[PDB]
Amino acid sequence: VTYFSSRKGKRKTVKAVIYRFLRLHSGLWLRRKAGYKKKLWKKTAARKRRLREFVFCNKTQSKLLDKMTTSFWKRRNWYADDPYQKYQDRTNLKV
Amino acid sequence: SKTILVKMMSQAGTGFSFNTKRSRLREKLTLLHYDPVVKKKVLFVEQKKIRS
Amino acid sequence: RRAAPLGPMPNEDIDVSDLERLKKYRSFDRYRRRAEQEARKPHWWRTYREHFGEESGPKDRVDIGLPPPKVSRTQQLLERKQALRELRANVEEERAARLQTARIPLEAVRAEWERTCGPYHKQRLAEYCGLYRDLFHGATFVPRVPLHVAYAVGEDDLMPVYHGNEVTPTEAAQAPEVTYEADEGSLWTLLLTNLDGHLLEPDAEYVHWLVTNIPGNRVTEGQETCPYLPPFPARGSGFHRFAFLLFKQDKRIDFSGDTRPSPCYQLAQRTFHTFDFYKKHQDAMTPAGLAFFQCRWDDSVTRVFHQLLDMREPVFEFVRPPPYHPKQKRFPHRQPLRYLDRYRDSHEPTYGIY
Amino acid sequence: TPVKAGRLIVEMGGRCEFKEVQGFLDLVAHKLPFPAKAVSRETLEKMRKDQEERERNNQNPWTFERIATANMLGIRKVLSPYDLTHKGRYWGKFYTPERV
Amino acid sequence: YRSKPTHGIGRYKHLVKAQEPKKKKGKVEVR
Amino acid sequence: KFTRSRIPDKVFQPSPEDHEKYGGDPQYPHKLHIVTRIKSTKRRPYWEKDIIKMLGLEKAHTPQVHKNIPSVNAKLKVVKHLIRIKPLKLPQGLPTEEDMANTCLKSNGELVVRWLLN
Amino acid sequence: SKNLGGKSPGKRFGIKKMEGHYVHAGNILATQRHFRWHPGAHVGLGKNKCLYALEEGVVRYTKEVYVPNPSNSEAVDLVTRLPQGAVLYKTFVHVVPAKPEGTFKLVAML
RNA sequence: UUUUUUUUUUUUUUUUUUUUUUUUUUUUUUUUUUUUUUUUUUUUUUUUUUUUUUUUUUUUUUUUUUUUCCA
RNA sequence: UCGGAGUACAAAAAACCCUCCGAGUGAUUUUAAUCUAGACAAACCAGUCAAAAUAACCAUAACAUCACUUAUUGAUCCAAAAUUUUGAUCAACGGAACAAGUUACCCUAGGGAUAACAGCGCAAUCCUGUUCUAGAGUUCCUAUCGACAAUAGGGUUUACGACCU
RNA sequence: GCCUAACGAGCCUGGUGAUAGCUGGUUGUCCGAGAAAGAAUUUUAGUUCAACCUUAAAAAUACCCCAAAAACCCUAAAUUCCA
């Protein structure tokens, strides 16, 4: 991760995270299950459903992704017909 | 004894294919599977050979 | 570490040595019979019944009823043996049995069952349905005398009321007929009690028809304390139990506190407790007849609620407990995207400041 | 072949006395790796009875078995789980009959 | 459990001794 | 493996001579324990350390008063090799609210209510 | 050395919930490789011989008679070879329900 | 998709003097079949360029056997 | 690399160039779906179950079954697929897309974390004494030896350890 | 082998503040709490997590834990769960 760029001197971000991850405005990160497109005939139906289902990331991975990504991707986005607009916020979090 | 992986498509017209392991020294595979597109018990025949 | 068993072990009686000389059972049916026979014994270890409510195990039931009829056992056995020998002497019955073509006089079987062993079956059915648990709370009786209750749905349609049958308020709208064998020297009291349907007090039950001082079998000639009232079960909570109790009494019982008015449309006045009633009239009354049936809601209940009771119809519903969910975590790990939907207040997008 | 303490190795009988069998078995007992004696039924009974008498008339109120069972002074930290059964008479493969 | 008083309540292999998974060997040794 | 030590119930069965030897009442057991920590918890198991911590015996050679109930008797049995236990004696009875500031604890195991009168 | 491949992590096969624990539906009571604990009332049986509570309540463990399914040939043969006084006993795990099925609430007094 | 053997009388084996057993037809044997004895016909799957012969190499399809991708 | 047994005796886990079995798949039809509570296990990635509800068959089961059934298997990316999939002993098996030997002509930064010489621990090996007598010694165990065995001592050789450099 | 006193490939300058998981050093006072290792890795001379631990903030149950309970041929010290 380039903490200070050479041209503008800003902090860059790794494009792999934006390519294979999604950040909700609540701070959670969304990712796909590993191996959901490899050897489907060799796996059980329940295993295939688990692979196809989305999953979340824990605190350590979330902090790592936040460090590796700039503040642009942490903004609030109001997309037209965004499926994840419902999951953008968090409710009834008693902590 | 070597097995063969065969891709079989539905005969209901709808595009729906699934892979199955078969014995090489057997005839063309033709079974009854379940199609969720039409949600019916449909006849599936061997279409392609994918993996040896 | 080893500990001493707290009692005899199950398989410590049979000898391990010389199994070949010990007889075995080769039938799964025999093994099942033996296992079920042993499973009912009070074992010293933790069993299924103790944890799943064997109803406090043994219970010394107080008996409040007529004494059993005194029958000569030897003469009864001799007569039964003679009848069996006479039946077996016939060749036509044996031919029918061989040819698998035989019929049974079901009406006579029913009559004989009611005469000799019907009371015990009725008592155990009432115990299963919990009649004694809510009428006396500590006492179960034997319905010695029969009690035939019948509702008239028209001119040629008669609905019987057996022990646990289902009778709708449409058929139960009118006062039923009660039949029982009795000489012209005894007094009887009939009480129709609805165990389920009281809106306020769970521990109280309603009275629909209480008629006391019945000379013999003439139920009509007896004075009615409470006029007959059609059943009025709730639309939601269905299958209430209505029980006819018949008591035999010796003296001419007169009571002024339990007397009901002719209209008797007040639910406050139609509040009853069989325990207190039998406490009051324990000296003379002794229960001898019982006939309980189930009744659910129908269209006829609305008319009873509106015209008769002058009330609005209560509607209930069998609501289930909400599903259990663990405490929501700040960062759920390996959870599906739908994890946030499990704690959503409503399926409406909420915009805070925008 | 493993042999523990108190296990017989060779058992002899006949119409003979005890002196000669002891005399010609003491050499074998000495040549054996573990210490051994040429005993008889009477000798074994006598030694067991003497051991029981000593262990019952021992004067000091403190005994190894009592201390180990009661965990006095927290001695279980130093001791071994097998010591609860050995009662201080057995240490490794060595057995001392005079330790009660 | 081993320390529980109800230990060995399921002990059944001592009640049956027919555990010979051999093809056809016969004893033929009763003198 | 070194683990906790089970103590058989035979150890805590008093002999008739024990009462006379230790000056105890064979009929009525005493009411309160005075416990004093003699040895250190170093070179001792962590569960024993925790028991000594929860018993309030952090400071050695300082008596502490506890109940005579089996709930605390279990822990006292667990750490019995590190403490001295005496029965609390009340020759003058329980001190009242007017004698709380004039009480004292003699080393013999008794609690004097009136101490240093003038 | 000639021995190789013996190294393998344990499968954590054991009892998860002890007696007296208040569990919910779907909680795995215990995992096992062979049939050590048999399910009883309100306890299912997964295809991997796992035991999971079907209702919300209290877990209990009992010793109860064992009547095998008639289609299980080995079990039926063992039962038939058992002597006249022998009855098989197995350790069953049960869940005693606590929450009732439901309640009747007034929705509208019309 | 790639690698390799290939295409024989009507059926199988060889080899270049295209032969040897089955099958077919015409006779004989038998009361009639079957068995057996004679005679006959029966081919290099096709294109192209050749050798002394072609078992020289190439075009269109036919079954074919193996491989068909660690990540 | 993965699974079973003992080590690891009774909730779980637990290592060695520890002692043994195996696995890198076959055969058959009941061709075995969608969605979603709640749980096991786990650093993560992975692996496991699964109540209710839906589509097709009895209008009463569907967890595919068997071979000790536990292991029979592989994360990105990328290629070919064409609508939905497949995938090379990455076998060093959490894996770089593709890279061999020799240096006594060697160099550099370090290591007594790691060897050879020495020292030190132990005594497998070695050397000593004593105990035991069957046997040799013409008779006779101990004049001179003395097999099968026991106990104790020394640290000279090799080997083991890798504690000081 | 020799190529200006060091040649398995000369010397100077520039890249160059080359890079080092490796060695060495790291400069005032006092006070509080305070850690010996489970999993991966061209990895065991290091890193990345987990378990512990430190500064803050929220809460409420936390250790000891009587019974009872945890397998089937035999099995010790004792373990897990809870008043």
Ligand SMILES: Nc1nc2c(ncn2[C@@H]2O[C@H](COP(=O)(O)O)[C@@H](O)[C@H]2O)c(=O)[nH]1
């Ligand atoms: N891993 C680990 N090392 C420790 C711990 N305490 C001390 N050390 C190490 O021990 C050395 C100092 O010894 P001490 O001064 O503690 O006797 C240092 O190398 C230090 O890093 C500990 O709790 N964990």
Ligand SMILES: [Mg+2]
């Ligand atoms: Mg009789």
Ligand SMILES: [Mg+2]
């Ligand atoms: Mg293992």
Ligand SMILES: [Mg+2]
């Ligand atoms: Mg391991």
Ligand SMILES: [Mg+2]
């Ligand atoms: Mg867990």
Ligand SMILES: [Mg+2]
């Ligand atoms: Mg279901």
Ligand SMILES: [Mg+2]
């Ligand atoms: Mg590697």
Ligand SMILES: [Mg+2]
């Ligand atoms: Mg590796």
Ligand SMILES: [Mg+2]
């Ligand atoms: Mg792994």
Ligand SMILES: [Mg+2]
């Ligand atoms: Mg040279």
Ligand SMILES: [Mg+2]
């Ligand atoms: Mg150097």
Ligand SMILES: [Mg+2]
């Ligand atoms: Mg060293």
Ligand SMILES: [Mg+2]
């Ligand atoms: Mg080291």
Ligand SMILES: [Mg+2]
């Ligand atoms: Mg030297």
Ligand SMILES: [Mg+2]
């Ligand atoms: Mg050396």
Ligand SMILES: [Mg+2]
């Ligand atoms: Mg030196």
